[PDB]
Amino acid sequence: SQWKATFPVDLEIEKNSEMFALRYIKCASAFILDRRGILDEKCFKTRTIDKLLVTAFQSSVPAAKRVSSTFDGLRDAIQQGYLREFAIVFYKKPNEEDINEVFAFRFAYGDEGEIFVSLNNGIDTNESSQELLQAKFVDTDNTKQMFASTIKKLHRCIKKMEPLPQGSDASFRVSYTEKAPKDYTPEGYLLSPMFYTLNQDIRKASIGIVCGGHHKIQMLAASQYLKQRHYGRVSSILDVAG
Incomplete structure (x- = not known):
């Protein structure tokens, strides 16, 4: 349960x-x-x-x-x-x-x-x-x-979410940088012309950014269940588990 047991340190190295x-x-x-x-x-x-x-x-x-x-x-x-x-x-x-x-x-x-x-x-x-x-x-x-700060706000946020209504499913969806060939798709994903789109009325949330020396990862969220070119995809996580 040391940080090192899950993550690497010396994050300055690429x-x-x-x-x-x-x-x-x-x-x-x-x-x-x-x-x-x-x-x-x-x-x-x-x-x-x-x-x-x-x-x-x-x-x-x-x-x-x-x-x-x-x-x-x-x-x-x-x-x-x-x-x-x-x-x-x-x-x-x-x-x-x-x-x-x-x-x-x-x-x-x-x-x-x-x-x-x-x-x-x-x-x-x-x-x-x-x-x-x-x-x-x-x-x-x-x-x-x-990390600690960010992951904490992630817990707080989900805590205030109404239950996920049954008959729902989940998808992994990825969008690419300009460095990526017009034909790239990662192993396990399928090519798709569709990323995802959100309603205008929906409540958003900024969870936080964490940084390595060469990568910066920002987390953003949106949900109905709160009170106040070229793409990739995994269509259904439920199906993958079966």
């Missing part, structure tokens, strides 16, 4: 910054899928880091292993600086474009100047990408605290 970025979104995802009951509690194992309870996929369960494996394609996508956004979307079967809830993870590699706020889809806003740009890596132990 290599270590890499591994951190993946495991971060893999951990958050595992938490998100658990607390919103996309999968059985049996699919997850839990360790405690200092203050915080952090979740992992339980590879002893084949259903968990199958879902856990979708991320292995993303790891390759991140080394090559291809992955821009990784988002978990919720919908009611089978209106896969009628989004009810989304947890989005947006990336920034080695202080890229700026990112085009695309405006017909996604959760990305002008103010969001500003914060992402301005956010700076300081040191590993500062990032440890940024």
Whole structure:
């Protein structure tokens, strides 16, 4: 339950910054899928880091292993600086474009100047990408605290969510950087012309940015269940687990 048991340190190294970025979104995802009951509690194992309870996929369960494996394609996508956004979307079967809830993870590699706020889809806003740009890596132990701070607000947020209405499903959806060939799709994902789109009336939320030396990962969220070019996809997590 040392931080090192889950994450690497010396995040100034690009290599270590890499591994951190993946495991971060893999951990958050595992938490998100658990607390919103996309999968059985049996699919997850839990360790405690200092203050915080952090979740992992339980590879002893084949259903968990199958879902856990979708991320292995993303790891390759991140080394090559291809992955821009990784988002978990919720919908009611089978209106896969009628989004009810989304947890989005947006990336920034080695202080890229700026990112085009695309405006017909996604959760990305002008103010969001500003914060992402301005956010700076300081040191590993500062990032440890940024993590702690961020993951905490993630728990608070889901705590205030109304239950996920049955007959719902979830999808992994990814959007790419300009460095990525027009034909790239990570292992386990399928090509799709559709990212995701959100209603205007929906309540959004900024959960926080965490930074490695060469990668900056911002978490944004939106949900009905609160009181106040070229894409990739995994259509149904429920189906993957079976």
